[PDB]
Design a protein around this ligand. Structure first.
Ligand SMILES: N[C@@H](CCC(=O)O)C(=O)O
Ligand SMILES: N[C@@H](CCC(=O)O)C(=O)O
Ligand SMILES: N[C@@H](CCC(=O)O)C(=O)O
Ligand SMILES: N[C@@H](CCC(=O)O)C(=O)O
Ligand SMILES: [Cl-]
Ligand SMILES: [Cl-]
Ligand SMILES: [Cl-]
Ligand SMILES: [Cl-]
Ligand SMILES: [Zn+2]
Ligand SMILES: [Zn+2]
Ligand SMILES: [Zn+2]
Ligand SMILES: [Zn+2]
Ligand SMILES: [Zn+2]
Ligand SMILES: [Zn+2]
Ligand SMILES: [Zn+2]
Ligand SMILES: [Zn+2]
Ligand SMILES: [Zn+2]
Ligand SMILES: [Zn+2]
Lengths: 252, 252, 250, 250
């Protein structure tokens, strides 16, 4: 019996500020893959909504007291009804919030410049010349912090130690990659987006793991299963694959 | 304890003759999405194989005696061990052969020229000026022949009646579309391929149904589940999505 | 937290009494396509259940006062949590109860003896020699009773006319097509089951419409969406195809 | 076409006797993570089964003659169709039996009293005051017994040395860490279960390796691939996560 508060953050090409001469307001400020997804979901399920950028600009992770930040935290405190973004479904987050079925698959990989001898995460772990990190308080950082795998523990030790290696967001990580001897642990669909538009960057190795993006809701929300049903409809209508190709579609 | 006989047929961009000055022989004659898929499957499961084009150049359908032709028939008579092509999984075919899990999703739609008033299958059914058909002895023809839906029965009546409307293959159907007032009932991933490379053709309407392509095997084959497991691995490694974009990737 | 009450009714091959040499009781009494479907749903959703045949043996329809009966009424009154049966999804019903996405598609058609000239609802309406009808207070009845089309408004006149035309259930109607000069307006997947067993019967014409069967729940049910997801998962794994082949296979 | 024989053994929280006020029998005797997993597999693949505890209570290892015992031996000799248990996937085992893809990941680690300075296998090997060992004829034993690494070739000397060091099962080993100055080399998901119940115990150090548990079948089994597909489907639906939370939750 109302509109929903949709939380999200700026991340190319998922959610971006549209270009317009005249000043746009409210939901009209945004375009991108997730904005389109949101429009399709609101249409099918018949709900109205308002988009708010999350204040601390973070996806979400736990401190030592066990308290969350980022979009995940917004759902916990019922300040939002849906998180509509490239929000990684993880078993850690499932303890605190709920996720629809995935609308896109991805895995962690490495973004780095072309031409080097580096071919895998192990090659980065072995050495210390080349620095490497991940986005701060995102799922990738959490993957390394929580890993029990010898190599990844080693890499978390390194990351965590260097005072600069954990970057505010993807844009800052991309800039560190371009500007310094730095490799970014990054999700593969974004690496795909970046490497199509920057011929001097490449993906290093394959996927370190495998997961998906899903719409987040507060735990117990009835919209979770409704959103899952709408996502399944769109996959059946092949609308998600058309949507990807529109926002993702050359390097010699 | 041997190599496998892989049956298939020429269909762009799934299976094609490679371009080379020097004459190529055997499996070296072919390239395309399915050729790549086959290489990845043989690698994972560790089997060797030989590719043979199916004689009558057909996918497969039943006559009145209930006898099959095309690739489906090759599997029935154990003349091949795997059908590796854009082979549509249908409940009709499952009675005679087995399929792996799908490696690609698709649905039936319409290919026709841009600019017209035609917007759906119903618009074609209503009238008779514009002729329309499907590939002969493929899953699309069978979909219309077997349909109990009023509109599709109407369209099958029309198709079936016109002596020319059922075309030998996609290439001939595409040519009829370009050359005459003709709309082709065609699977959506191929329509996608064609409309990216011919700016005067477009998809008409959405998908009429929803299904997938799978690797075919003779009924009871142990390779069926092994191929399913290998397909799942490739999806996990995100190799199928990379493979699609390589063979499918502009129109103002 | 408790066992869900499932309402249903006897209808081959969806729900039937299992054969035995002793008196069976509880859920153990039943088998069939819809029983197998219920078992999948209970496993996937993780619930226990008790099957209860609907007292009045009706699918469900409204009277002039607008009150419901049959399984539909059981859901409305919260006497049952789910209806698991070949329950037709219709707009009128969607106003009083919720349905899952369909687990089977079908349409109205005609069951009749082999070997006559009658070939469509057309042929039957043009004439009054061969009698005809449908199950009382079912979706097929309601379809004719609400149709604006002329050929069917025609037939509803006939059915609303004769005192006998509307049979109590499919069994009585199949009996009548074997006993008297009578054609039964019946849903096509059931026609399919019957004509494969009774070689002296056949379907007449095509499908008069297109619709589906769904699992019924009372409005506001915390289970309907989960049940839709379960049905979508069954369909994806070809389980509904296999389930139909199990129970449908002249 | 017949009921599959499932071999397993008692190990909390994977397989345990259910509590009751009467004597239970058959499959009804058991509960736990692996029992729930078996039920999912039986439902998905559509088979009936009979659970039989392995006579010698061993997971399985080779002797000098190269002959096997435990559940592994039961599969080799075709006395059982499946092994459903926390059965570690190892190369040596992969030579004699087939495994599904893993349903759980784990690694070797150390269980010990809280409050001491010992902090890794390192610390334990450097010293001989605190005694240590592992389950006899299990995968952890075989890991130390085959290791070329020095710190572990070290410890296998110690374990192959003392007559007591190798315990009969996890229960005896946990008892011993509570009873005597003894550290148990044990698999990490089991350490996790225990330390959440016994607040005076803790894990020492990290994971010495990485591997997984899988369903065991005899070589050439017509069920192994189907079982892998079923496990992949469970994992996709987060069912294995939910199953672990059910049985693992100081
Ligand atoms: N999509 C990630 C953020 C990016 C990353 O962590 O690599 C998340 O939901 O936390
Ligand atoms: N892929 C189809 C052929 C093309 C079509 O029928 O549209 C088949 O397997 O039969
Ligand atoms: N399946 C119908 C009953 C049979 C019929 O009306 O033909 C219903 O749900 O009402
Ligand atoms: N899970 C082990 C037994 C326990 C251990 O060796 O620590 C096996 O399969 O042999
Ligand atoms: Cl019995
Ligand atoms: Cl009853
Ligand atoms: Cl009891
Ligand atoms: Cl026993
Ligand atoms: Zn989970
Ligand atoms: Zn595409
Ligand atoms: Zn099927
Ligand atoms: Zn892509
Ligand atoms: Zn099932
Ligand atoms: Zn109630
Ligand atoms: Zn209305
Ligand atoms: Zn299950
Ligand atoms: Zn045997
Ligand atoms: Zn070896």
């Amino acid at each position: 019996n109302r509109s929903l508060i949709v939380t999200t953050l700026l991340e190319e090409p998922f959610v971006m500020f549209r270009k317009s001469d005249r000043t746009l307001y409210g939901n009209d400020r945004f375009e991108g893959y997730c904005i389109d997804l949101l429009k399709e979901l609101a249409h099918i399920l018949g709900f109205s909504y308002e988009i708010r950028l999350v204040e601390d600009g973070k996806y979400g992770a736990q401190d030592d007291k066990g308290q969350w930040n980022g979009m995940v935290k917004e759902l916990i405190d019922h300040k939002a009804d849906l998180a509509v973004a490239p929000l990684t479904i993880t078993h850690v987050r499932e303890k605190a919030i709920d996720f629809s079925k995935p609308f896109m698959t991805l895995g962690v990989s490495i973004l780095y410049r072309k031409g080097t001898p580096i071919d895998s995460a192990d090659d980065l772990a072995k050495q210390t010349k080349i620095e490497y990190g991940a986005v701060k308080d995102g799922a990738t950082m959490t993957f390394f912090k929580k890993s029990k795998i010898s190599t990844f523990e080693k890499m978390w030790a390194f990351m965590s130690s260097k005072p600069s290696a954990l970057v505010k967001n993807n844009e800052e990580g991309i800039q560190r990659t371009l500007t310094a001897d730095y490799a970014l642990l990054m999700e593969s669909t974004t690496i795909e987006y970046i490497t199509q538009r920057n011929c001097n960057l490449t993906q290093i190795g394959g996927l370190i793991d495998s997961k998906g993006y899903g719409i987040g809701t507060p735990m117990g929300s009835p919209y979770r299963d409704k959103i899952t049903i709408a996502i399944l409809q769109l996959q059946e209508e092949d609308k998600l694959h058309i949507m990807k190709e529109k926002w993702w579609r050359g390097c010699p």
